[PDB]
Every structure is written in structure tokens, then in C-alpha cells.
Amino acid sequence: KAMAGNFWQSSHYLQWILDKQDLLKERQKDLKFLSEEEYWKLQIFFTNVIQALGEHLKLRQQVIATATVYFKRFYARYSLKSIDPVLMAPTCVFLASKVEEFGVVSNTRLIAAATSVLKTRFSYAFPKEFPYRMNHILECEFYLLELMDCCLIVYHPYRPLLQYVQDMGQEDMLLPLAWRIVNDTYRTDLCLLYPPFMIALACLHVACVVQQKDARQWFAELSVDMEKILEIIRVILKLYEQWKNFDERKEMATILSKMPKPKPPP
Amino acid sequence: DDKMDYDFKVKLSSERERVEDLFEYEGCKVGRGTYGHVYKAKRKDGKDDKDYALKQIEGTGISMSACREIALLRELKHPNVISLQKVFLSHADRKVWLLFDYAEHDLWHIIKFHRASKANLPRGMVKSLLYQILDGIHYLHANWVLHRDLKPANILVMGEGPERGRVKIADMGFARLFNSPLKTFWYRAPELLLGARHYTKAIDIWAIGCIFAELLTSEPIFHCRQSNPYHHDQLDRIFNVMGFPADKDWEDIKKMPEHSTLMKDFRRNTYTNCSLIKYMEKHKVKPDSKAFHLLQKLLTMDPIKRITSEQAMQDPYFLEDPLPTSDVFAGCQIPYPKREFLTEE
Numbered sequence A: 001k002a003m004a005g006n007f008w009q010s011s012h013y014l015q016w017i018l019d020k021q022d023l024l025k026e027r028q029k030d031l032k033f034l035s036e037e038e039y040w041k042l043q044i045f046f047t048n049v050i051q052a053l054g055e056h057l058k059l060r061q062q063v064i065a066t067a068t069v070y071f072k073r074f075y076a077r078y079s080l081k082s083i084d085p086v087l088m089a090p091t092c093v094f095l096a097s098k099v100e101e102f103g104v105v106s107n108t109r110l111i112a113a114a115t116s117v118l119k120t121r122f123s124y125a126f127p128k129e130f131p132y133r134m135n136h137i138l139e140c141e142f143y144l145l146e147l148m149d150c151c152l153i154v155y156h157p158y159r160p161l162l163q164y165v166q167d168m169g170q171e172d173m174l175l176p177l178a179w180r181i182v183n184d185t186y187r188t189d190l191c192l193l194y195p196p197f198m199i200a201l202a203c204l205h206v207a208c209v210v211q212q213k214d215a216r217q218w219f220a221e222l223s224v225d226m227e228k229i230l231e232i233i234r235v236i237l238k239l240y241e242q243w244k245n246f247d248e249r250k251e252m253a254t255i256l257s258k259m260p261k262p263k264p265p266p
Numbered sequence B: 001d002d003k004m005d006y007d008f009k010v011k012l013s014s015e016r017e018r019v020e021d022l023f024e025y026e027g028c029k030v031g032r033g034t035y036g037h038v039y040k041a042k043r044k045d046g047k048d049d050k051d052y053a054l055k056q057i058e059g060t061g062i063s064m065s066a067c068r069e070i071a072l073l074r075e076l077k078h079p080n081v082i083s084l085q086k087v088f089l090s091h092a093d094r095k096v097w098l099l100f101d102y103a104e105h106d107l108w109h110i111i112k113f114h115r116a117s118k119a120n121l122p123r124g125m126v127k128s129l130l131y132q133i134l135d136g137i138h139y140l141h142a143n144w145v146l147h148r149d150l151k152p153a154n155i156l157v158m159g160e161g162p163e164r165g166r167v168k169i170a171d172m173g174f175a176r177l178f179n180s181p182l183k184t185f186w187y188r189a190p191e192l193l194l195g196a197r198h199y200t201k202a203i204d205i206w207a208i209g210c211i212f213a214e215l216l217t218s219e220p221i222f223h224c225r226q227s228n229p230y231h232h233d234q235l236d237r238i239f240n241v242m243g244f245p246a247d248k249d250w251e252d253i254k255k256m257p258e259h260s261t262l263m264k265d266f267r268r269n270t271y272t273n274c275s276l277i278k279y280m281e282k283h284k285v286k287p288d289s290k291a292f293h294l295l296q297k298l299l300t301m302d303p304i305k306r307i308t309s310e311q312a313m314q315d316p317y318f319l320e321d322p323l324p325t326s327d328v329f330a331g332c333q334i335p336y337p338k339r340e341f342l343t344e345e
């Protein structure tokens, strides 16, 4: 609930809704080693890593989403060369957990979760075990916080989605599918480009089209830039075509070897 | 780190703003507590000549406490709530520093100055303080942010400068695990003492009631000598002021965990002569004044019958002469001394 009604004066809105062309210009650094398809395949993979880390640790979806966004924001600015994203991913889960107040993740529980998740659920992408100790996470935490400019409160499309479905009165029919589609939007850049509520309307639009509910007049009763909603719908539909044509399990070893790697000292 | 990029590590090291380089604060420690350490500070690379406050946080790393403080102050912006200006992370010693604008005064020190002198003042200063406090807590509550630890010491007031006489709320009790009190009792609402498992907006408003009584009398209304949440003497003191609550007064009191304990220890007969009217009359405050009627609504026993900050701000007290002013001191000379410098040892 903290800061619920403050999006339009929040640090998310004022610093972390980015320009698409600016985003694409900073990305060209990592596109010397990876293709546009391979980089997206990388993003999809590590979003699944963070989800898997969250589920092991028994964190609610909103905490996982915040950790997902911390990751995206970081790599929107800096190279994959900068810090190993194998180390960054649990660091984001760890920092995000501390933003919450109900329960704490301990050190040994985080490193245990990172070790176990990668060995059991991701041994297709990683031959060797998770090499990092706790003090590595702790060093990485400081860099994450600093380089996000201490911006920790992230707004997500789930809250507006709950509000919209109840407005329609189709919670049983639409909510599980729409909530699921919201989860999938984190496989894209959507959260860096549009306010949460627009992402949620798009997700609910697609849930209606899949389930063949007609909400043409309900959506008409809204006051919103519909071109921007359609933009987001196109991104969701393009993601499902990648999904079809992407075998994560077969491809990620090769892609992770293409990733540019941190230069050590002499 | 071997698998962190060297060029990325030294470029960020070249560029990092280090606190010891930017500010002068040596020997200017002004606070020391659970929170860590606070220093009054001037800027070295002198663009401005303002005084600043530098908080070095207790412990190391990023505590959940530190994290929620950073997360929330990063978003909160209001004239009556202290503003975070910058955050310095010191990687070597693993310490976190927070930068705020400096407030010379607070209600603890201010009220202790009146206590000292009167033992041997501007009209509307009490009213203005109360309004600005209510404006600050309203901002937080509207953002679903509770304070959780409201007392005179953390109600700061700006000294000489451009924000002269403005209230700045501070030290918001960020991080209480599970929003739980159970994980000075003078400012704590009767529900807390009777075993309430969670903090609330209403608990913040009681504390403001106590601070309002204290500004009027120069005396802590529930003053009391000197684990689990039940505290006998603190309840006795409340009942000596307010009287013992009837069933009609607080219907849900039965639902409190320490209600059986209260019944076991306290009898209505004991406090039959007591009331807030008589207490305030003994401290030279008129019970038919709008000042009193608002206080009575803030210090309501049953939490669901306590008015919100929103409605307190709407009280016609604030329409009565004298009005609230932005400058609490109303342009009059500040008689209160500047803060005292503490030691490291």
C-alpha cells in the first residue's frame, strides 16, 4: 500500500519511464556480441531465473516483480559486461525483500536458494555450481542501490488489474488469465516504457479476446490513449510468437557464452 | 571481484561522491541513538552557505530498517516532513549516510525551555505547531505511511533561514516487522498497552493528542515513572486524567488481549472523580474553548472513535483568531538556544 496513490509524483514515473530510442541506443553496446533476438532471449531467461528464485524463497508475486524491475533498470543503463547477471539476479531478490516489512530473508537462505535453484531448475544453462559467497551479494547490493539512484518503490500492473476486473464484474472469468498475461509482460521492456495501469488494460484486453468476452463498451467508457494500449497489445502478441519459436532449454548455453564478460585486473 | 568489470569498477570509483570530501562535520555530532549518529554540517565545495544534517546509520550493510527508510523518504515530499536530499554509500566501511536540511529546534527542547523559564509564548504558536503536525501526518497517512513513534523529540522545527519556523516531522519508525508493536510509554495509545497486534492511523493521532496537551501545559499529560505490551502504571496514569472507560465509551475493549488483565487490576470506583475537563482546568486551560474540544477528540479512548488528521485540520479552532502561520514564531525573535555538540567517546 505504501505510496499507492502517488504514481504521478513518484520516482518510477519521473525517472524510470524511459524513452524507447534512448533505451535502444544504450543497448547497442551489448549488440556487438549479441543479436536483438539473442538479447531478448537473455532477458526472458533471467526473468524466469528471478521467478524461480522467488518461488523457492516463498515471496509474493509483487516482491518478485520489483526484483525483476530492479534487474531491467540496471541493465537498461549498464552492460552485461559490468556485473555478472548470475550474481545480480539474487541480489535483486535480496534487495527487494528488504523493501517489505512482513518477514526477512536471511543470508544463508538466499545463497542456499541461488545454489539449489540453478542446479535443479537451470542445469541446461550452467555446468558449474553457483560460485558466489554471501559477501559478493553484499558488495553487489551497494552497486545496485547506488546505480538505481536509491529508487526502490516500484508500481506494478496487478493493483490496477484487480480494480478493473471488479469494475467489470468478471473476476472468476478473466482475472487468472489476465494476471498470468501481466506476469508475461515482464519478459519484455513494457515496464520501462508505459505506466502500470496501461499495461493492465492491455493485458485485460487480450484476456477478453482469448476468452471471447465483448468489453467494447466498457473499454469505450474509459478515458485513455487507445493507440498506446494497442501498442502494448502488439508487444504481448509478438512475445507469444517468440515463445513459440524459442527453445530456452536448447539455446541458453550458447547465448550465455556469447555474452560479453567482465574484464579482470592485471 | 574478479568477475566484476575492472573498467566499470574504476570509472565508478573515479566518479563517486565521498561524504568526507563534500561536507565538513568533524566534531559537530549533534545526535546519537539507536538510529546511529547525526552531525550538523557545512558544504566544502561552497555553492551555498546552508547548514545540513548528516545521518550515519547504525550497523553496516543495508538493514531492512535502512532500506525502508531509503525507499520511503525517496518518494515522500511535503513541507512538514523532513526531506532526504542525498544518499552516500561508503563501500569500504559499508556505512550508509543520509543528507537532510538542518533543523535547529524541536518540541522536546522547546517545551523544556518553557518549563525551565516559567519555573523561575507568541499567540498562535501552539495552534500553528498543531496544524503543521496534522498537515504532515495527513500527508503520510494519505500515502498509507504510518509514523509509529511520534513524540516531541522527533517533531523538529526550522531555525533562522528561509524556512524559518516551519515544522519538520522526522525519525518515522520505518521497519517494524509485520507492522507489529510486539517485536517512554507516555505517548502510546491505550490499545497498544492493552495488547494491539498492529499499528494504525489512530495510534499516530493519540500521540498528537498527547503532544497537544503538552504544548498547552508544558507537562507530559500521561507522565509516569520509568517485554510484553501491558504496563499497569501507564494505564493508571491515563485513567487518572481521562477516567475509566464505560462500555458505551469503548465497545470493542472486550476484544483486546489484555482486557481480562485490566479487569483483574482496575476498578471503576477508583477514577469516578476524574476527567480530562478537570485535568485541563487544573492546568489553566478553559474546557469551553475550541482548543479543548479538539484535544478531547484527539485523546478519545476507543480508536475507532478518534478523529482523523483530515478532520482535525478542518476543526473550527483553526478558523478562530489567532490563525495558524507558516512561521510558527510569527516573525518574533527565536529565544531558544542552538544545538549542543556531542563527543565520539
Ligand SMILES: CNC(=O)c1ccc2cncc(-c3ccc4c(c3)CS(=O)(=O)N4C)c2n1
Pocket: B030, B031, B032, B035, B038, B053, B055, B082, B100, B101, B102, B103, B104, B106, B108, B109, B153, B154, B156, B170, B171, B339
Ligand atoms: C535520528 N535523527 C534524524 O533522523 C534526523 C534527521 C534529520 C535532521 C535534521 N536536522 C536536525 C536533526 C536533529 C538533530 C539533533 C536532534 C534531533 C534532530 C532530535 S533530538 O534527539 O532532540 N536531537 C539531539 C535531524 N535528525
